[PDB]
Amino acid sequence: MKVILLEPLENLGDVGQVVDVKPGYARNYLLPRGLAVLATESNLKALEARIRAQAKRLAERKAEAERLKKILENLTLTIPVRAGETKIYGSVTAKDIAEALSRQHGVTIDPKRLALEKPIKELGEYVLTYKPHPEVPIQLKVSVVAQE
Amino acid sequence: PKHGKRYRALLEKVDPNKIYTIDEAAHLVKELATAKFDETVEVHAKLGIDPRRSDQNVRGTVSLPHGLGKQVRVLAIAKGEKIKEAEEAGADYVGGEEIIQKILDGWMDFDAVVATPDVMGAVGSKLGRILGPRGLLPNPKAGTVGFNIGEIIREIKAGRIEFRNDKTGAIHAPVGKASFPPEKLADNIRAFIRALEAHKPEGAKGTFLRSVYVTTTMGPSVRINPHS
Amino acid sequence: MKEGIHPKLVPARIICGCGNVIETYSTKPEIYVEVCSKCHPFYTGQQRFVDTEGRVERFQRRYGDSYRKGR
RNA sequence: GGGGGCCUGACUGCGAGGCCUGCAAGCCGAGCAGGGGCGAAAGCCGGGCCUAGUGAACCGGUGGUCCCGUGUGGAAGGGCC
RNA sequence: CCUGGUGUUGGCUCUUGGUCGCGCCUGCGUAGGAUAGGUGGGAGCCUGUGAACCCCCGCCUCCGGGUGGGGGGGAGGCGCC
RNA sequence: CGGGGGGAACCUGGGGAACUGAAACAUCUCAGUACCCAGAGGAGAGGAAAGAGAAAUCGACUCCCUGAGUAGCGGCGAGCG
RNA sequence: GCCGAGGUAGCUCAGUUGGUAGAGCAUGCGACUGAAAAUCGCAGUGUCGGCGGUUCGAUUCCGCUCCUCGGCACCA
């Protein structure tokens, strides 16, 4: 009984597999309902279809990632700060970096992620690890200084 | 995960997970145990038979090459001639209707019997009700009765071994002296293989040659393949 | 006919009966049952689209439903 | 028929030729071969002192044999004793 | 008609039996230090208790005692015979 | 658009029986016949080989003669074949 | 015919190393029984259907044999 699962991983744990739930059993008892289907070249393939698909999807993001990680991790990140010769009257929030690099220089990266506990505003420049894609991190050299 | 037998050395030496084979055997057994007085390995094992009908209560032999001189002894029972031939050939205990008499009285030292047909009846009956089934009345079917007593006691001493499945189907015997050449151990091994395979009673019903063990007196133990 | 099969007939005949064995194990026949009989399967249902039935026949069934199930 | 010795023919292959038979049965046997046993040996022994202790054919068993096998090598099954 | 198997006749679940694989563990007839289940090899084994003296404990019952241990330890014991 | 309703006999399938024989009669037998039905025709039926057969060939299907009444089928019997 | 089962002293039950046998009830002798029964004590008392057998040694272990019982299939 090639029970191909949509919402299953045992219980409703979706598209996790395909198992044997005996005749009718599996049939009208667990999947008629509608939590999966049975083999068929149509199905087996279908799986293969969306699987391959995600493969390309993920590989892909990996790629746009690489393009920007490279361009960026290479380039220097400079920014005009406002104050004395340490923390600025204001603060440097990684987001601040965000709009900064983003449209001031070209490439936009979401605020959210990056490595910034307390805004840093000690003025001068720091280079840190701000993760950009899953296990492909983007660390960068952000020199920031009083715009005097 | 720590037991009680310093022998643990030899113990680790062995790794019963494999029944391996005859020769590799000879080798590793030798290598295995030369404790106080170099090894005197032995093979012990059992067959898929049964006690009830004695059609399987086998025993016998097969010289299986290589010299000898000690083990479960015997009585040569016959007449002067045999005294000479069997006695010198290889007979610890030597007599006949004479030794039989002696026995009836109280003297005797022989579980194994070799009575020739010249006092065959003499011993069989005079001592029948003497030796009793402790395995002593020469019975024509156990390398125990016949013409060449000289020959049987002879090899007994020259290079012997015998069969005798104990209580529930096991035999015990030697097939390849201590450190003695591995190949040699292999030879007597297989030799017994056959001897046995032959004695195999027609009343077997399944996997006959069962637990095939080669082990040492006081030493390791593991099965072997009476095959390659 | 109002009782065939749907996916291929099964409403059918049969002549039966018997004897006694022993045969190639000590004896000849043992025969005396000129009798006649019936012979058949089952019935079940599912849905076209929010209204339906099934009817059919056991096996050929399982196959079938799977099939028109494909649509 | 009563007693003792040793022994298996209370044998296979087979029998010419007759009693009685309507069929079938059933009953009689010298004699030839191997082959033994009885006795030294002349000759007896192919169950008993004889006439009653009996059943076709089938179907199926078994111990042989070692003829048949369904394109052929085997085998199930298998033909005759 | 009643009646095992079997197909539609699906989920969860408490549970108990046989049989093998294996580790453990058991073996009390009377003389027998001594509760020998056989049959083998077959005069030694061990020092990881440095030990057989003792300690209590885990265990097994036909009083005894067999067994696995924590410990306490200071050439010793048991096998051999 | 089509059917349907008929038709002596032939056709296909559908379901499908006692006599009588086996001097009884239960397997067996009349037989897949009589007979009820549906349906196609002018004839339907079969009809281009998971065929035949054993030599190294045959070569669609149907109908006739021959093939044997042998191969064979069985209270191996009546018979059927 | 097959399998499961019972068979030992007048009645009936008891053992798996076998390797040593009765036991409860009726039978004989003796206290109690002033009668009785019943009570106790004792005795007597035996092939574990048969046979051999493995088996030292097994009666309960092996194989076959009697009468019995239960439930299948044998004669076509």
Please give the residue of chain C at the shortest CA–CA distance from A39: C66
Flag whether residue A25 sits within 8 Å of chain C, measured between CB atoms.
no
| C39 is known to lie in a ligand binding site | yes
Domain B67-159 annotated CATH 3.30.750.24: no
Tokens of B129: 């009700």
B216 Cβ contacts chain E strand, under 7 Å: yes
Under a CB-based contact definition with an 8 Å cutoff, are residues B39 and B179 in contact?
Answer: yes
- DSSP letters for chain C: ---S-SSS------EE--B---GGGT----B---EE-------EEEESSSSEEEE--HHHHHHHHHHHHH-
* Whole-Å CA distances, A123 to A17, A90, A100: 54, 10, 15
Which of the 8 DSSP states describes residue B54?
A: G
Any idea which fold B15-66+160-228 has?
Ribulose 1,5 Bisphosphate Carboxylase/Oxygenase (3.30.190)
Checking each nucleotide's C1' against the CA of C19, the nearest proves to be: F27
Q: Do C70 and A42 touch (CB under 8 A)?
A: yes
Experimental method: X-ray
Which of the 8 DSSP states describes residue A147?
A: -
Long-range (24+ apart) CB contacts under 8 A made by C28-31 are none
Tokens of A30: 């667990």
Which of A40, A44, A45 to mutate: most C Cβ within 10 Å? A40
Alpha-carbon span C2 to B219, nearest angstrom = 84
C21 Cβ contacts chain G strand, under 7 Å: yes
Starting from the edge strand earliest in sequence, which strands make up the sheet with A36-38, in order? A18-19, A3-5, A36-38
**Domain assignments of chain B as residue spans, ordered by start:** 15-66+160-228, 67-159
Q: Could you give the angle at the alpha carbon of C28 between the alpha carbons of C25 and C34, nearest 5°?
A: 125
Resolution limit in angstroms? 5.0
Residues with CB under 7 A from strand D: C 24, 26-28
Answer positive or negative: Cα dihedral of B207, B211, B213, B217.
negative
CA A11 to chain centre: 28
Tokens of B155: 């090899």
